Amino acid sequence: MMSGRPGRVPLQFLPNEARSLPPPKLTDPRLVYMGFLGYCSGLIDNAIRRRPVVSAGLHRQLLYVTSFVFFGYYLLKRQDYMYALRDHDMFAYVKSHPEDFPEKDKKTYGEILEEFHPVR
Amino acid sequence: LQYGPLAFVLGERTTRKLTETSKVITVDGNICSGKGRLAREIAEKLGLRHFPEAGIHYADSTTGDGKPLDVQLSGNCSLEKFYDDPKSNDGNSYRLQSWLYASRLLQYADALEHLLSTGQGVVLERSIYSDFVFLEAMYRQGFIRKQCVEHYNEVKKVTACEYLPPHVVVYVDVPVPEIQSRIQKKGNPHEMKITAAYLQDIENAYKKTFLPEMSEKCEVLQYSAREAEDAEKVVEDIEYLKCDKGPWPDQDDRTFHRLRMLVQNKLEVLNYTTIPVYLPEITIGAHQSDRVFQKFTELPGRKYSPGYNEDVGDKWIWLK
Amino acid sequence: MNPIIYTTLIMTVMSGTMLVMISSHWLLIWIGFEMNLLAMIPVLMKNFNPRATEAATKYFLTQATASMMLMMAIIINLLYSGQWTITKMFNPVAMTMMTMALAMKLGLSPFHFWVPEVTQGISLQAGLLLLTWQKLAPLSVLCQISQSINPNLMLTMAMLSILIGGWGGLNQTQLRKIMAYSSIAHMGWMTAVLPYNTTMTILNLLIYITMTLAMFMLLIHSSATTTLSLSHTWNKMPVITSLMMVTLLSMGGLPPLSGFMPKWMIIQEMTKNESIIMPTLMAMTALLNLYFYMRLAYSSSLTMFPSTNNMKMKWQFEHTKQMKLLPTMIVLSTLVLPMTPALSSLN
Amino acid sequence: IRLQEDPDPEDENLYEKNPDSHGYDKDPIVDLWNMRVVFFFGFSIVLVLGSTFVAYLPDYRMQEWARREAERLVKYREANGLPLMESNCFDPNKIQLPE
Amino acid sequence: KFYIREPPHGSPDWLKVGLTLGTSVFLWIYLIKQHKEDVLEYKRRNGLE
Amino acid sequence: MLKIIIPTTMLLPMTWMSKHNMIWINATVHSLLISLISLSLLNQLGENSLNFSLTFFSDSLSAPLLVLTTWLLPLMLMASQSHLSKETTTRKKLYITMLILLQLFLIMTFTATELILFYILFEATLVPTLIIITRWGNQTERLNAGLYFLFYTLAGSLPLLVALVYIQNTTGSLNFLIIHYWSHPLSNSWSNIFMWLACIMAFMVKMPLYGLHLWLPKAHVEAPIAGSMVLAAVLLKLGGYGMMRITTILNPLTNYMAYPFLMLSMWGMIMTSSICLRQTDLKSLIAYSSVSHMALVIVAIMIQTPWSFMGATALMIAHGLTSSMLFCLANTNYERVHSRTMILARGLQTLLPLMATWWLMASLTNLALPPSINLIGELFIITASFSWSNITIILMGMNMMITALYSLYMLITTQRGKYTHHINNIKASFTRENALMALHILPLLLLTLNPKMILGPLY
Numbered sequence A: 001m002m003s004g005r006p007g008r009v010p011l012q013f014l015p016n017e018a019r020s021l022p023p024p025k026l027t028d029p030r031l032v033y034m035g036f037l038g039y040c041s042g043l044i045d046n047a048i049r050r051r052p053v054v055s056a057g058l059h060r061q062l063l064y065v066t067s068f069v070f071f072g073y074y075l076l077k078r079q080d081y082m083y084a085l086r087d088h089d090m091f092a093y094v095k096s097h098p099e100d101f102p103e104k105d106k107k108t109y110g111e112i113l114e115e116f117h118p119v120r
Numbered sequence B: 001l002q003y004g005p006l007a008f009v010l011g012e013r014t015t016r017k018l019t020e021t022s023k024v025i026t027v028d029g030n031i032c033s034g035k036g037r038l039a040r041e042i043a044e045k046l047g048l049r050h051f052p053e054a055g056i057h058y059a060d061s062t063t064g065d066g067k068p069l070d071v072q073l074s075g076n077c078s079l080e081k082f083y084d085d086p087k088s089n090d091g092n093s094y095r096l097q098s099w100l101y102a103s104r105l106l107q108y109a110d111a112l113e114h115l116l117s118t119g120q121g122v123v124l125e126r127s128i129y130s131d132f133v134f135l136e137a138m139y140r141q142g143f144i145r146k147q148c149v150e151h152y153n154e155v156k157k158v159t160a161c162e163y164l165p166p167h168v169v170v171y172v173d174v175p176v177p178e179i180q181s182r183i184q185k186k187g188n189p190h191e192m193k194i195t196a197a198y199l200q201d202i203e204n205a206y207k208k209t210f211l212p213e214m215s216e217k218c219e220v221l222q223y224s225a226r227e228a229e230d231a232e233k234v235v236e237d238i239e240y241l242k243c244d245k246g247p248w249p250d251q252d253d254r255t256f257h258r259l260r261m262l263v264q265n266k267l268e269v270l271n272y273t274t275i276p277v278y279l280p281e282i283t284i285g286a287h288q289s290d291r292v293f294q295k296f297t298e299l300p301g302r303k304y305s306p307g308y309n310e311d312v313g314d315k316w317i318w319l320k
Numbered sequence C: 001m002n003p004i005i006y007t008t009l010i011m012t013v014m015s016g017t018m019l020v021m022i023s024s025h026w027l028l029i030w031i032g033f034e035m036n037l038l039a040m041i042p043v044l045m046k047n048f049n050p051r052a053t054e055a056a057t058k059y060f061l062t063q064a065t066a067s068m069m070l071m072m073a074i075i076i077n078l079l080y081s082g083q084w085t086i087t088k089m090f091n092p093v094a095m096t097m098m099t100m101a102l103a104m105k106l107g108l109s110p111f112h113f114w115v116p117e118v119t120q121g122i123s124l125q126a127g128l129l130l131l132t133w134q135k136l137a138p139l140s141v142l143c144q145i146s147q148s149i150n151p152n153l154m155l156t157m158a159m160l161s162i163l164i165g166g167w168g169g170l171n172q173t174q175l176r177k178i179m180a181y182s183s184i185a186h187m188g189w190m191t192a193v194l195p196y197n198t199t200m201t202i203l204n205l206l207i208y209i210t211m212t213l214a215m216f217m218l219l220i221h222s223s224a225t226t227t228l229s230l231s232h233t234w235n236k237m238p239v240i241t242s243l244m245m246v247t248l249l250s251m252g253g254l255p256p257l258s259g260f261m262p263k264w265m266i267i268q269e270m271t272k273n274e275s276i277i278m279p280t281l282m283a284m285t286a287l288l289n290l291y292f293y294m295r296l297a298y299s300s301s302l303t304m305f306p307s308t309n310n311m312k313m314k315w316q317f318e319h320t321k322q323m324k325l326l327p328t329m330i331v332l333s334t335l336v337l338p339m340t341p342a343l344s345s346l347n
Numbered sequence D: 001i002r003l004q005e006d007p008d009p010e011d012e013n014l015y016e017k018n019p020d021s022h023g024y025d026k027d028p029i030v031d032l033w034n035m036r037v038v039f040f041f042g043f044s045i046v047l048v049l050g051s052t053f054v055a056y057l058p059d060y061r062m063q064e065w066a067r068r069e070a071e072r073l074v075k076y077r078e079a080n081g082l083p084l085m086e087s088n089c090f091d092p093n094k095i096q097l098p099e
Numbered sequence E: 001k002f003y004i005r006e007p008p009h010g011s012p013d014w015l016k017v018g019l020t021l022g023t024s025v026f027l028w029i030y031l032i033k034q035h036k037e038d039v040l041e042y043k044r045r046n047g048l049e
Numbered sequence F: 001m002l003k004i005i006i007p008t009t010m011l012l013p014m015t016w017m018s019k020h021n022m023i024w025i026n027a028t029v030h031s032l033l034i035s036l037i038s039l040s041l042l043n044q045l046g047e048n049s050l051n052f053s054l055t056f057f058s059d060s061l062s063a064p065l066l067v068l069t070t071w072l073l074p075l076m077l078m079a080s081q082s083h084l085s086k087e088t089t090t091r092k093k094l095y096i097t098m099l100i101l102l103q104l105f106l107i108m109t110f111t112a113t114e115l116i117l118f119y120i121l122f123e124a125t126l127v128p129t130l131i132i133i134t135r136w137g138n139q140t141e142r143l144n145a146g147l148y149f150l151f152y153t154l155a156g157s158l159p160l161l162v163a164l165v166y167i168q169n170t171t172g173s174l175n176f177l178i179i180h181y182w183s184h185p186l187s188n189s190w191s192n193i194f195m196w197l198a199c200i201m202a203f204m205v206k207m208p209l210y211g212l213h214l215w216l217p218k219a220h221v222e223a224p225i226a227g228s229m230v231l232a233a234v235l236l237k238l239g240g241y242g243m244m245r246i247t248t249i250l251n252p253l254t255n256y257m258a259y260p261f262l263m264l265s266m267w268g269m270i271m272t273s274s275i276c277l278r279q280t281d282l283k284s285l286i287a288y289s290s291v292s293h294m295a296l297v298i299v300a301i302m303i304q305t306p307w308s309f310m311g312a313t314a315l316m317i318a319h320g321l322t323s324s325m326l327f328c329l330a331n332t333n334y335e336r337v338h339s340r341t342m343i344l345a346r347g348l349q350t351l352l353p354l355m356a357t358w359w360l361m362a363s364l365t366n367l368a369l370p371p372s373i374n375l376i377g378e379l380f381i382i383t384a385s386f387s388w389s390n391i392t393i394i395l396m397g398m399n400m401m402i403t404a405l406y407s408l409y410m411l412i413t414t415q416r417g418k419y420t421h422h423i424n425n426i427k428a429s430f431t432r433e434n435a436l437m438a439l440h441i442l443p444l445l446l447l448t449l450n451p452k453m454i455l456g457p458l459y
């Protein structure tokens, strides 16, 4: 779908047109879940390595957390930019092809005859 | 920096440590044959490391604080019980036989570790290669079930294959009556119950399986009790051996690296001593397994990992 | 092997795969497959036993036959278009030849027989490499030529892969063969949505590689290759078996775990194309994989099998080496379902 | 021996060491406090205060409002001769039938 | 001490501890500064401010 | 819903960070506190639903179910801590964690505004439930029970997943409100017939429908007591709640698609009530009685009347409470004689008088004695069925007769007659067990004073 999109330069995680969108907030629920994933990784690291799972290596658990949040922020930016691109192309295509997307003639339920099915 | 690929890559080679006296010597013989004296003076005068014979608590000695643990948590077998009721229904005969073979595997790994890491030779009292003598002796006396020697053969075949045999196999030759008189001399009441048939079976296994089969991959040095007291003569014959048999001559740094990798990893050394072959003498039920494991975990310094046990005096858990 | 030589051979395997994924020219793609196979054969024979030698020989035979068929497909395509660029194939029989060659390289069902035997015959590290890294190059080629594949051929092979992976894995007590049959089923799941959405293929591949890495690293940590040997692991390191159970539940696609994401996304994308019978068949068939995963979980963590007396020795010892990124692989393979909309980053 | 297994242990009677056992814990103090927190938070709070909270919940379903509306409508319809309820729920002027 | 053999993890790896703390602080600082400049870039591209 | 969900999530850190001997105290105290908070969801509106956010909403159907779940958690904790007294601290914390995870999943399942989110949350309940059954069950039969429960549920659920994503692709939304307001009549075609079957069969096997029920005796019998409590009390109700939600897109196809299911449940309530008359396992008898009440719920949902839906809601609530009470009562005797055989321990009223009183109350509620809410639900469903067809009164009257017979038969065989001579270990009832029965029975009877709280949104 999006592979051969025009202007799509290779090996570029965020293109420069993404800087027009709002960056994700720092307390973004998805970013906080990223940090939680890092914290779980640190706890499981203590468990497998046979260390006290909660209080051993606070620097290591902390680094797990911050690296997970660091990757999550950029992942969120790229995801949001891809969805913005999707909506951008969809609206452009609906605009360029009005015949494929007609203006449906709206009618009220007072003139629309819906069939009644009794429950009995 | 534990010896790994990165250490071996830069400059860690073992041939540059190997020398003429960088040999592993195993002293052997029946019970009360006096291997202790021969081995200890051999090590002291040839400048090697002595390893006292691998007991029930050898593993307890090489881990933790080096003190023996309760028989319930380590061993779960007795030698006095074997000397009192060798044909008991507990399976204690083969449970003991497997535990001390595993201890011998651990000790052979530990001795090869010292040799390949420092270059110094070692001397051992018995080894994995002469552990089967007692198994066959017990079998002829009808202690172990035939099922229980097939399992022993399986474990020995899949574990001992990975290691290099001793350079020198020194054997002390004592007749059965003299061994019997020495057992009656030292006064151990459990040793006092050892029948002459058991000792004769042990000597026969030595003479007809052990000594001949070492003769094709190592140099075997036999002394009776008279020539075993002259350690000077024994080490003189040790120094006169060519040692051009076996796999030791055709060893290069590539194979020594793999051997050091296996030998330093104790969990890989003992891997196959716990194969899922369910024999009543050594199978542990799930309830007993779980309970005994929890009681082991409750030991001081045994719960988390060395250096992470605050209850034993370990600091900086939160920065490690 | 020499550590430098083993590192070089690993790097050559990855560089063959990268050559496959970065080339626009069919000859260079074929070169990448050749280089990957050449460097891969020695890592299979690292331990060198007759099982390892036979595994390497069967692997070589299948991969070389597939490579020759791929070259023939390239030559037929050039014969009719004069084109070397990897793009839609201009000839239908060349396309069929290429599809069969790529499926044989992947190990899809009609060409699946090599996967269980080779996985059993090699070590767990070799199997980890075999079932994770070796899927990248053929799948990337397939994603590049997806617009010209015959959907009937591809969907047939994918459905057969799911069925055979489910059935074959039902009979296994060997962990490596169980992994191989699970891999066959997951390859079928990947290749079913390939005609419709290659992004779904990439997503499923990433999730499967995460789970397979976690499971193989847990097996290496356990030193277990049979179901009974794994049944002793609770009495040594119960954390490993509980983590393995949650990973197996993820492999079964049970919500709310990460393994449910690829199935759910693929079913959605297929129903978007008026494909309803095939997704229902696929989801129903995956219950076999879940059945033998649950059998493994029963024997490993949810119940306690008899231990041995010699296990008390292992209690006093730690691991000499530690599996890299295993905690991350475990968390990623189980806990990432709330992050699903991030899949659009793969667009 | 068929395997090394512990014999099945006998069940412990909480009353034997603690005649005053409430059945929560082998330690008498935590057993007592378990009983206390269970009874307080269950009966004193969730049951009594919860039942009172549900009993005095503000108008549920707006039934009183519906009754007052119905009373006003009944008064207006009866005082003016209008039917108390029409069969047509919706006015037939905002309905356009097809034919 | 208590153990016969010296535990590999008997004392903190001070170089590794310092590296871990430093790389985490840098990651946080870099993330905060990137978000600040990203909000700024969004506001000026979109004419918000 | 976050003021309910987040405290429940906070049970896990609190459980894992508490002392080894404060585990049960802390979990019980704070789960009761969460149940107190869940009561505020019973303030409902006549017409609209409580639409908190885009992702969670509450109405008169789901609020009593949420209260039932939050109430069941502490009773679970009191029931478990006896048989898990010899367990390790970590394993007790894992059991509590499983129970908390189950409660959290159930809470989000009953409030999910979207159908696919409901699907994932309702499928997530399998994992802690399966773990509980297979890890902490007592017999070798727990493994086969776990397999049956898992694969029955999944064979039901996967076609539902396919149908849900198809509906989202064709309609554009799986949002409950949008689904209701944009409802299209379902035409008569094979496509729509199989869409109906896919939308219905998962909830059918969950309830369970007679003929698809063979997992339930295994699972409810082999599970530990807390597992049986949840399986009978809240997990069966997932099928009824989901069926009530999803039947709004299945009309008028439900008019004739329900005939095989109506026949199956109307006859299978008779069949399973008769099975109870001959069950030699007490826990199995209690498990088999759930099938009949759930068959009544199936009929009520399938005939699609306001009275039928009111009765089905009330019956689900009442059955949850009563079945959990009965399982606890059987478990108290099991913990004394270490057996589920019913004629093993007879004449228990002359040894445990107040426990015999608890047994009589539980039997009376299972009898649907008026004015209990069991009777209210059953009677409403019976009246709606009588309107549906008068001949339904034969089968439903037969069922209530047989239900009376087996309930009172269980009471008589366990409590009455002469005590067993060689059973000399029937210790006096602990305060904990009596409190468990009291906390089962008191809210059941209090609901009779305010029956509209459990009559659903059609009240």
Ligand SMILES: Nc1nc2c(ncn2[C@@H]2O[C@H](COP(=O)(O)OP(=O)(O)OP(=O)(O)O)[C@@H](O)[C@H]2O)c(=O)[nH]1
Pocket (backbone or CB within 6 Å): B029, B030, B031, B032, B033, B034, B035, B036, B037, B053, B079, B082, B096, B097, B100, B131, B134, B135, B191
């Ligand atoms: N069952 C059994 N006992 C063994 C085994 N290896 C050593 N022992 C016992 O270990 C004990 C220690 O004495 P030994 O090492 O045999 O002899 P010793 O008294 O030191 O005398 P020397 O052999 O002359 O040094 C004896 O009771 C042996 O029977 C074995 O593999 N099996």
Ligand SMILES: [Mg+2]
Pocket (backbone or CB within 6 Å): B035, B036, B053, B125, B126
């Ligand atoms: Mg000795």
